[PDB]
C-alpha cells in the first residue's frame with residue numbers, strides 16, 4: 112500500500128449531548144422520553160471520561176471503537192428509577208420494571224448510563240412525583256409505551272370503572288427522601304441506542320478526512336469500512352463527501 | 363381467578379403502601395426520641411395513629427381470601443400474620459373496660475408511693491446495697507404490701523377478659539395464645555405443637571437442676587457468714603437476701619461470694635482512658651470485628667444520621683441503648699456512649715442487632731423479623747460473649763501484652779457469669795409456669811398466694827419472711843406481670859445463646875474449653891451464621907436452627923459444657939456443707 116486515506120462525511124456540528132444529560136426535568140419511568148439525534152458529529156470519549164457515572168455499560172459495541180463509527184441514527188431514552196432496579200435495565204431481565212415499564216431486546220446495540228441524583232430530586236417529606244406502572248395484563252414488547260390508566264380487574268367481577276375490592280389502579284408513585292439507603296435512592300438513567308440502515312450515514316465522527324487518490328493500491332476507510340485495494344472511477348463504495356461511485360479492484 | 367394468584371396481587375399492592383407508612387412512623391418516633399420537647403409528641407401520636415388505622419382496615423380486607431386454597435406456604439405466612447383478629451373480636455363495651463384496666467395497672471405500678479419513696483431509685487438502692495437484715499425487710503414488705511395490694515382486684519378481671527378474648531380466636535386460653543409463637547404447621551417433619559412447649563421446657567430444666575443445687579448451697583453457705591443467725595443450713599434463702607427486690611438476678615451477691623478475693627478481673631477502663639478513646643473509636647472497633655468475621659460493612663447513612671453521644675444539656679433525649687431499623691434501607695444506633703468497658707460490650711451487642719437487621723432486608727414486609735422471639739437476643743449476646751475474652755482484648759491495642767492468665771482468675775469470672783445466667787432460669791421457669799397454670803384455670807381464685815409460695819420453695823428454694831394470706835398479690839409487682847408481657851423468651855434466649863456459641867466455636871476449629879473461645883478471623887463461621895441470618899421469618903425456626911447448630915430442638919448440653927470447670931470446683935467446695943434444701947423451715 113502506497114498511501115492511506117480515510118474518507119468521512121464533512122459535517123462539523125456537535126451533538127446535543129448536553130441537553131439529554133443535563134435536562135432540567137427528567138420524566139417518569141412509565142412514560143419515558145425519546146430524542147433522536149441526527150446529522151451530527153458526536154464525541155464519546157469525553158462522555159466516557161466524565162467519571163460522574165455510577166454505571167456505564169455497552170452491548171454489541173466496543174467501548175472505544177464507537178468513538179470512530181458510522182450509524183444511521185442515534186436515540187436517547189431518559190428516565191428515573193430507584194437504585195436497586197437499575198440491574199433490570201439490560202437485555203433478558205425480569206421484574207416490575209422490565210415487564211410493565213421498559214423492555215429492551217436481546218440484540219441491543221446501545222449503551223446504558225446511570226448516575227445517582229439524590230441531591231437534585233429528593234426532598235424532606237417525600238418526592239411523590241415519579242409514578243411507575245405496577246399492574247399490567249401482559250409484558251411489554253421491546254420499545255413500547257403504554258401510558259393508559261385502565262383499572263386493573265384482578266379477579267372475576269366486572270369492575271365497572273371504579274376501584275375498591277379487587278379493582279386496583281395500576282400506577283403507583285415512588286417515594287424518595289434524603290435519608291434513605293443506597294438501594295432506595297433515585298438514579299437517573301439514559302439509554303443510548305445506535306441504529307444502522309441502508310440510508311446515507313448521518314452520525315459519523317469525529318475523525319478528520321483526507322484526499323482521494325486513484326490508480327494506486329491504497330488503504331481506505333469509508334464510513335468505518337476498512338479495505339485495501341485500487342480505487343477506480345466509474346466492490347463499489349460510494350464516496351461520502353461528493354456522492355460519487357468509486358469501484359474497487361484488488362492489486 | 364384462583365385465590366392464590368389473586369392473593370399474590372393483593373400482597374403486591376399491600377407491601378408498597380406499608381413500607382412508606384412504616385417509615386413515616388419510624389422517622390416521627392426517632393425525632394421525639396432524640397428531641398424530647400413539645401409538639402413532637404403530637405407528631406408521634408399522629409404518625410402512630412395513621413399506621414394503626416391503615417393496618418386495621420387492611421386487615422379487615424385480608425379476611426376475604428379463604429386460607430385453605432393457598433398452597434404456596436409463603437403467601438400462607440403473610441396472610442396468617444395479617445388475618446389475626448386480635449382484640450377487636452371482643453365487644454365494644456368490654457374493650458374499653460379492658461384498656462382501662464391495662465392503663466390503671468401500668469399507672470399503679472409506675473407511680474408507687476412508699477412512705478415518701480418511689481421505686482427508682484428509692485427502693486431499688488435500699489434493696490441492692492443495704493446489707494442490713496431489717497432495713498431491706500421493710501423495703502421489701504412495703505412494696506409487697508402496697509403495689510401488690512392495689513393490683514389484686516384488677517388482675518382478677520384482667521384474667522377473665524383476656525381469657526375470653528383468647529377463647530374467641532379459636533385458642534383454648536390466653537396461655538395458649540402466648541405459647542402459639544413456637545408453632546410450625548404444614549412442613550412435614552418439622553412440625554411443632556403448642557402442647558410441645560410445656561414439654562422440653564421441663565426435660566431441659568430437670569437436666570440443669572444439679573448445677574443450680576450446688577450453686578444454691580454455695581451461695582447459702584457464703585451468706586450464712588454475713589447475716590449471722592438468720593439463715594439455717596437446712597433451710598432455704600429468705601426472699602429479701604437474694605440481692606434484688608424480686609430475687610431475679612443474683613449479681614449483687616458477687617460482692618460477698620467471691621471465690622478468690624485478691625485477684626481482680628479484666629477491667630480495661632483505664633487502658634481506654636489512657637489512650638483517649640473519643641466515644642466513637644469503640645464503634646469502629648466493633649465494625650472491624652464484624653468485618654473480620656466476614657459480614658458486610660456499615661451503611662454510610664449510619665455514620666451521619668445516628669446519634670452516638672448525648673447532645674448535652676441544651677438538647678435532652680432519653681437514651682436507653684437501642685438499634686433502630688426504620689425501613690427503606692435506614693439504620694441507626696441510639697446510645698449515650700461513655701468511655702467504659704460496659705459501653706465497649708454494649709456497642710458489640712447493639713451492632714449485632716444491626717447486623718441481624720441488615721441480613722433479611724430482601725424479604726417481604728411481613729417476613730422481616732427474627733425466626734422466633736428468642737433469636738434476636740441470642741445473636742446480640744454471642745457477639746458480646748466473644749468480644750469479652752482476654753485473647754480478643756489482647757489482640758486490640760489495650761490489655762498490655764504479657765498478661766498471662768491463671769485458673770484462679772477464670773473461676774472468679776465463671777462464678778460472676780453463673781450468678782447472672784443460671785440463677786434466673788428457675789425464676790423464669792417458675793413465673794411462666796404459674797401464669798400458665800392460672801390462665802388455664804388450674805389454680806382457683808382462692809389459692810393464688812398459697813400456691814405461689816409452694817412453687818417458690820420447690821423450684822427456686824426461697825422462703826418468705828412473713829406469711830402472705832390470700833388477699834395479697836405478689837407476682838403482680840413484677841414489671842412483666844403487671845404490664846402484660848411474655849416471659850418465656852428469657853428461658854429460651856439463654857439456651858440458644860450457648861448452642862450458637864458451641865456450633866460456631868466448633869466451626870472455627872478452636873481447641874480447648876469454650877469459656878475462652880473467640881470467633882474473629884474465622885470466615886467460615888461467619889458464613890455459617892449468615893446462612894441463617896439471611897432467612898428472616900420466612901422459614902420455620904426448627905429449620906433456621908438446623909442451619910446453624912444441627913438439631914431441630916433446643917438443648918441444654920452446651921450450657922452445661924460451658925460451666926464444667928465451675929461445676930467441678932463447686933462440687934468440691936460444697937462437700938463440707940449441705941446440698942439441697944427443705945421446705946419446712948420458715949423464718950417466721
Ligand SMILES: *[C@@H]1O[C@H](CO)[C@@H](O[C@@H]2O[C@H](CO)[C@@H](O)[C@H](O)[C@H]2NC(C)=O)[C@H](O)[C@H]1NC(C)=O
Nearest residue numbers: 654753754755756757758759880881882883884
Ligand atoms: C486477625 O488478623 C489481623 C491481621 O490483619 C490481626 O491484626 C494484627 O494484630 C496484631 C496484634 O496487635 C498487630 O500487631 C498487627 O499489626 C495487626 N495487623 C496485622 C496485619 O498483623 C488481628 O489481631 C487478628 N485477630 C486476633 C483476634 O488476633
Ligand SMILES: *[C@@H]1O[C@H](CO)[C@@H](O)[C@H](O)[C@H]1NC(C)=O
Nearest residue numbers: 128129130131132133158161
Ligand atoms: C452537564 O453539566 C456539567 C456541569 O455543568 C458539565 O460539566 C457537563 O459538561 C455538561 N454536559 C454533559 C454532557 O455532562
Ligand SMILES: *[C@@H]1O[C@H](CO)[C@@H](O)[C@H](O)[C@H]1NC(C)=O
Nearest residue numbers: 119120121122351352353354
Ligand atoms: C460538504 O459535503 C457536501 C455534500 O453534499 C458537498 O456538497 C460540499 O461541497 C462539501 N464541502 C466541502 C468538502 O468543503
Ligand SMILES: *[C@@H]1O[C@H](CO)[C@@H](O)[C@H](O)[C@H]1NC(C)=O
Nearest residue numbers: 396397398399400401402677
Ligand atoms: C427540638 O425541637 C425544638 C422545638 O421547635 C426545635 O426548635 C429544635 O430545633 C429541635 N432540635 C433540633 C436539633 O432540631
Ligand SMILES: *[C@@H]1O[C@H](CO)[C@@H](O)[C@H](O)[C@H]1NC(C)=O
Nearest residue numbers: 370373433434435436437438
Ligand atoms: C410463592 O410465590 C413466590 C412469589 O411470590 C415464589 O417465589 C415462590 O417460589 C412460591 N412458592 C413456591 C413453593 O413455589
Ligand SMILES: *[C@@H]1O[C@H](CO)[C@@H](O)[C@H](O)[C@H]1NC(C)=O
Nearest residue numbers: 425445446447451530531532
Ligand atoms: C375474625 O372475625 C370474623 C367475623 O366473622 C370471622 O369471620 C373470622 O374468621 C375471624 N378471624 C379468625 C382468625 O377467626
Ligand SMILES: *[C@@H]1O[C@H](CO)[C@@H](O)[C@H](O)[C@H]1NC(C)=O
Nearest residue numbers: 650653654658659660661662
Ligand atoms: C468495606 O470494608 C473493607 C474492609 O475493611 C474496606 O476495605 C472498604 O473500604 C469498606 N468499604 C466501605 C464503603 O465502607
Ligand SMILES: *[C@@H]1O[C@H](CO)[C@@H](O)[C@H](O)[C@H]1NC(C)=O
Nearest residue numbers: 621622768769770771773931
Ligand atoms: C487452680 O485453682 C485452684 C483452686 O483453688 C488452686 O488451688 C490452684 O493452685 C490453681 N492452680 C493450679 C495449677 O492448680
Ligand SMILES: [Zn+2]
Nearest residue numbers: 711715739742
Ligand atoms: Zn439487645
